Write a protein that binds this ligand. Sequence first.
Ligand SMILES: Nc1ncnc2c1ncn2[C@@H]1O[C@H](COP(=O)(O)OP(=O)(O)O)[C@@H](O)[C@H]1O
Ligand code: ALF
Ligand SMILES: [Mg+2]
Lengths: 394, 579, 452, 453, 50
Amino acid sequence: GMQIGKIIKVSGPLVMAENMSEASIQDMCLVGDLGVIGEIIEMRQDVASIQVYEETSGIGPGEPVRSTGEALSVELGPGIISQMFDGIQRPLDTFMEVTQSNFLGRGVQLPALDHEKQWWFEATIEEGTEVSAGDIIGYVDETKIIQHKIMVPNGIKGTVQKIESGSFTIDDPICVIETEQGLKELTMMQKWPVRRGRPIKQKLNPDVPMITGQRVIDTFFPVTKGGAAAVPGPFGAGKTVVQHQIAKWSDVDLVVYVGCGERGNEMTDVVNEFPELIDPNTGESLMERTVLIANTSNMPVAAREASIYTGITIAEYFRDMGYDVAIMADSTSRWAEALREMSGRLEEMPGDEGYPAYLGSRLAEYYERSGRVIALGSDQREGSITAISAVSPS
Amino acid sequence: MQIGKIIKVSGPLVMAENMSEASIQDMCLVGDLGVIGEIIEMRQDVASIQVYEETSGIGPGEPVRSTGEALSVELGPGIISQMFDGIQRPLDTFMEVTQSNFLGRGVQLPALDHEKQWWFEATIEEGTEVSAGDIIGYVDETKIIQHKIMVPNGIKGTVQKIESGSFTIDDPICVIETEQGLKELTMMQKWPVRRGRPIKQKLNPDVPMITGQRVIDTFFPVTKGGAAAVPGPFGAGKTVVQHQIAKWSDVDLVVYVGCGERGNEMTDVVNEFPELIDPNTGESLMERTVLIANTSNMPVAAREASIYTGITIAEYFRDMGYDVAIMADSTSRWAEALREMSGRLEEMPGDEGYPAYLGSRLAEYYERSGRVIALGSDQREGSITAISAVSPSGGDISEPVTQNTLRVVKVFWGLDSSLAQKRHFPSINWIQSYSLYSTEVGRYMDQILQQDWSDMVTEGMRILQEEEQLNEIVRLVGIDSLSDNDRLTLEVAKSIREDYLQQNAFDDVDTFTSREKQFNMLKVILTFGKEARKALSLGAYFNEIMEGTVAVRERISRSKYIPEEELAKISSINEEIKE
Amino acid sequence: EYRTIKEVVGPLMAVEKVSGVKYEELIEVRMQNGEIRRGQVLEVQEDKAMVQIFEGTSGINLKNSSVRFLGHPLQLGVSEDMIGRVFDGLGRPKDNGPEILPEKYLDINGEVINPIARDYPDEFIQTGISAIDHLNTLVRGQKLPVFSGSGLPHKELAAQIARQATVLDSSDDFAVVFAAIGITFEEAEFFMEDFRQTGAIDRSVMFMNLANDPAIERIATPRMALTAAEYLAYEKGMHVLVIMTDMTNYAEALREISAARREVPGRRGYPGYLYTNLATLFERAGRIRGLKGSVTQIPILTMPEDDKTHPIPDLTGYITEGQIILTRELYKSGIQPPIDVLPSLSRLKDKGTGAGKTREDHAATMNQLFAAYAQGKQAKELAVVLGESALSDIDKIYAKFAERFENEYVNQGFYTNRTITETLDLGWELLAMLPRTELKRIKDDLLDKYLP
Amino acid sequence: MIKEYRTIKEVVGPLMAVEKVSGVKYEELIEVRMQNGEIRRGQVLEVQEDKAMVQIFEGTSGINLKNSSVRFLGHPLQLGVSEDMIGRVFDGLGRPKDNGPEILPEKYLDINGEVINPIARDYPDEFIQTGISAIDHLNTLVRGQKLPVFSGSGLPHKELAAQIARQATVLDSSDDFAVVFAAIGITFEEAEFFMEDFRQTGAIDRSVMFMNLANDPAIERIATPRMALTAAEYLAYEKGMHVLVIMTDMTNYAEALREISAARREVPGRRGYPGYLYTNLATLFERAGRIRGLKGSVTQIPILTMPEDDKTHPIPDLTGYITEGQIILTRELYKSGIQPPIDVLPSLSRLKDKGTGAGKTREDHAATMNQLFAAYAQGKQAKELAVVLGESALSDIDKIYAKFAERFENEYVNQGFYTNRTITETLDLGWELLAMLPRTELKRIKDDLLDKY
Amino acid sequence: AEEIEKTRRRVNALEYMTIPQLEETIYYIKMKLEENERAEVTRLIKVKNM
Ligand SMILES: Nc1ncnc2c1ncn2[C@@H]1O[C@H](COP(=O)(O)OP(=O)(O)O)[C@@H](O)[C@H]1O
Ligand code: ALF
Ligand SMILES: [Mg+2]
């Protein structure tokens, strides 16, 4: 029931549309007849200004624009493991097979997770139990390595009325909660915006040393479970060599590799070499416990800007299951190049060396979401997020 | 018939309504005085008129009339040896009519003298298929330059009646039988300055030019049809090169354009030109020089016209098959005129406020020059050489004017202040300057004198490049630990700098260096550094070979002074340096 | 057809009473004298649309003029008969040859390559240059630019690489897509004369955009070339080499368009979306999984004031795998091509060089001659600071190495094609001056195999 | 009729907007009758539709809008020119300030002036003996020349200007110089000192002066220099006099135009200064030279204080691109007591080649001059090395030069603000400074000139 | 001892004059360029509002 607005003016990458009173600020929109990637920036009366992150050739006035009704979010549920996405969570493994092409066509929209695949839900809780946000009702063996634990989504308070195990898709209701606002059904799929982090009970001090397997790290320069490490990556220094040994030997549950913005052929490296890593405890591929983010330099700027904000939202989701997650950023110098580009398109006051003035606060927003926290729920399990970011100065 | 009414006057920007019949880029007579202007933009019935005269005392309500044609110039007999303003009005005739030494307002005078009588000698005969660019006759405007009257563009037919006699520029001298009808042709043709004269084909300039300057003709040469830029700070020598190049260029015509500079510069240029007698011709340099002058205190918008006026006059002469050299002193003032208008047009400024289309207009200017096959059945060869002077603030060549210029030109004569203050002239920075023609001119020069000139020039540049490497590592460290071999290179570079590069225009001798002199002096200094290398490799200390060669090293100093006839003096230094 | 001209400000004009107009849509002005001029949509509104005329607005009467909207942007009439034909910045013919019946009409924008669909470039490319093929190896499917400067011989090097580019033992000819962006007529004639005189035009498709042509014409010129290179490689399976120069004039054309829309610039007076603009063109390359064809892009840009922190080379280094840097000091000494290998790097050279690729000693001799030059260059400077007396017997050889490496290895000539075999053997001769104790990077198994 | 309106729109700083007007011309002098009787002059800057934006020279201080009026005069700002101007004191707008009789104007000339036809121009090759060896020998001053003096805050720029006008004359002639002075936003102490020197000399009566001090409104400083150059060319070409122009401080003039440039919300250029600064300074500097057929001449000696002592500042930079050379005063030479502290290395004169030589000054001036600078540059280069690497470390050949530059600063340049040395005494002194170096190191003097001297 | 003293003062000048003069010079150079581009984009925002 979203109100469709009509473009009144198109200039450069900026597109103006009226009849937009229903949409909220910073929402995503499908601009034009084609439906390109557009984010609401400012709105005056019923007219909203939308920065278009795809090419603007072929679009003009009269064409409609559909607001998604929400900010940049991620689908969180079974399927997300061992599947590659981009900065805005577009499944590349699905784009490849379904579209029958090797390109990302303008306006082509595909759901993030697999909404048709069957998963065996193993109900661990029975009816009549008081539940809140965070409590685990059951898990699905999504992958050979990980036990995806389905949790009660935020904002739901009531009594478990009816639950049953079996096999469902991520769009099928597996439980019913008798809330204060009436009876509500829960699915295995939950949406969450990449801009705001997932709530927690009490953040804790990262005092658990991590065993990376590398002697120079664990001895003299150790990172803790919930810490943060910055790594410069000059060419020839074996930056990818040190990365693979950390994502493989570290005592973590899930690895969330994030490619902010990278060179095409440099990215193909990561798409081919990262699955070739074997998990040491079982013998399967490292992809089983990894969620890869794939953004080249020619991706839309929204994908490069919210590249690290996407993976950290996935990390916080798996963190709330009690798992210890390591997130990898390579390279953050290209991520800031997306924020520097945003500050120019938005006509903002520049900070130091062209980067926006809110660069220090944006980095503060990211690295403050990682750490050893106590996830919500009665169990009070301790999750961990450790950030291993790479910098590449000019 | 439309009489426009002024609605706004903001400096040289005047806006007027009731203009719906007129078009863009049309000349106008603004105000009660009738000052000259031009439409630059058009919104509804209101037109923004870029006025080329002072707008003091003009308000809304005064009439404004269009002319129907764009800014054009009179290309015909009577242009040679004459100076005109930015709109090509004769300043000498301007003095005679107004009867005053000061510039007035609201007066329009034709460029050429339409009442002067010339002797048109007909060359073509009746009954010939003619087209644009074909020569039907000529008028000897001076002793050297044979002003050939050609068929203007857009006229294609058969000559029916033509004969020689004594006519004016207006008088019809020929009748062409075209498809449209019988057309009468005159000795004068009008042409828009903002439209370049067309050609048959654009050839590549590989015939170099003899300027007479040693640093120019050896390390940073310019070919007939090239584009050279001379950026530098004030007092560096930008105008000296323009004057000396014009005085000693082998070209058939010179178009010196003064743009936003000092009026006193134009005076000595007009006085000295008839005195610089060419001994091989008997005539002077004035009889091939066409002057255009719009000083700095004159209307700013006229600086745009002065640039497009001179390049248009150069195209009227290059269509005849004669090499023309156009001098733009200075381009910076033209660039200033744009920014000042762009600010009054509320346009988006670029770096330092310049309009974003600066690099476009610069590219649109220099691309007119070059070796070109003029229109016509004879396929005559014409060429225009652009020599521009840029005046960046504080010697900062990172400004958009110089940066956009170096993306379209091929030769860069960067002037240095540190050398100008040390009385080094011409103050051309050897490391900083360059020339894209240095490779092809080396191949030509290697053949004319039959000597490996391209590689002995490379050796001189290498020596000057090695000094800059030494001097920069030795400024702070000091030269006390300088190896004996390295010290020789320092004395080689010092000889190259003070003997060959340092040359004064005022002394009659250093002003011109011929191709035979430029070789002999180079042969002395290079063979010195090459054979004195063999002396230092004979177990010799540095101090010695110099002390015993001060007599040779002085004859090397006055090597520029040798008259052209007495060149054997220079070549005889090769044997005494060996002994 | 519309005869409603409201505003005309310079080469820009606005047309009211419009509907269904799109961005970058092609328009056509019908003047009062019958003259026809074309234009592109720089901005559309509901009641008006601004367009820039290519030929300009000189002499246009607003009241008696007309404008026709075509309803489609700049498309390329692509066909296989384009081989050997030279066009302009807008796809118009320039060689006055036979007309080409388009097989398809594709918009010059193109599509974004799926990063997981991208394949790894594995094949070596022999450019014939010792400084490139040995120390900064180009790979089939790599984005490797050439950082030059105003006055540096980048035109001679651009004519040499496209002339000497070949793949080993593949038995399929390399396809060359050359695109001159805003160059002068002289430099354009130098390129066209060199491709015709050597027979390389029989393998090439050239797009020629001059400097005096409109700014909107410069912006479409790379989009024209990459769309044809995309078609030759991905639709037909050819191996395509894309060469572009000068890249800086493409950025200045964006500034004239950006200022025409009254957009405030970003860093150093350039539009904010440049990173997206340059990456859109630079990432339309590489081998594709399931397709035999490949696109190899080699941009060429001149750095303003020879600054590496300038937005044009700073963002290019973030997008392209490596960079080839030319220096003004090497060119003024007589080193052709003046390619400095110390600041130049190749981010994919490791796969390009090895056994089966070139030879087993490619990676070892690269790392050996690399450190031998930096030590030889510092030794020559030590002879300037401390004199030749402080130089030992070993330092005198290192100073002799750098001097020969500058004059004999890199300085090969703009018309000298050196095979990979002749390149490596020359490096061994220059390395044969130093004793074995100096050569530490190379293992003695291969050091006792090739060292003379 | 009397064009006066009483419908004021708005008053913002020095600017002002009147509506419902008609017949208002551009650059039109106006008058503002307020509600108390005061009159303040101004000029029209823009006229569109029925509106007119003007600039008030004395500023808008305490102006009621409803009860004030604007009187348009229908002509640009003019100056009452007459020969009775000789020896008079006018303010920065033209009103006499010496409490004397009102001038009966022989004519009313537009302060904007007129452009001299370059064909009607006469090239100035005349020689002026300024009594200063650093000028007469190194950067020769000619009649009709555009030669400014660059200085800084606190430097003795006011002492040097009085010295030149006190000692200026021409060779083989008895003509006197009609000096024209213009104060632009300077302090009272600088102006009073200049007045006392002019009195002492006896040339005060000859000079015509316009006064704008620091406590005066800054807006009117835009017209004050145009007052002088209109009166200067009036006495030169029409009255047949040799006119000398000296103005200070030109720095305050540029600051005045930036205030209006900032008030008008124009598009700024370098450091907020307007983009047409090179043109606006050109309307003042190019009012100099000689005209063929007229016995008059206009010589200009501008004076400006370089902001932050930086030559790359827009004010001294654009001045050099217009004027023929410059004369630079450095704080380092004044630091050493050098009077005058003239730095002759960055200084230059461009009209001197035609003003020197046999028949004008000396046959060998050009060869000595060229030989001087080159050896001074290297001697200064060697001194800057002596103080860093030591006296003994310097080469013996360079060490002779190190003393060459020392005597060429304390004896040659340092001569005092009251020493009128002749051109013969200046050129003979120069050879005595070249006799130190051996004959072999004098390479830019020919043997013929080396032998005779 | 004499060559020791020449080198000694050579070294001393570099540490106390040449290198510090550059270090302070670079500071002022970088300072100017940033505020200049900072104030340059500032007016471009004001001109965009016209
Ligand atoms: N080639 C030269 N030989 C001798 N003197 C020169 C030369 N070039 C410049 N100069 C000196 O520099 C002064 C200014 O030169 P000019 O070219 O007018 O400077 P600009 O760069 O302002 O045009 C001249 O008066 C002259 O004395
Ligand atoms: F004084 Al100039 F160019 F003539 F700086
Ligand atoms: Mg000059």
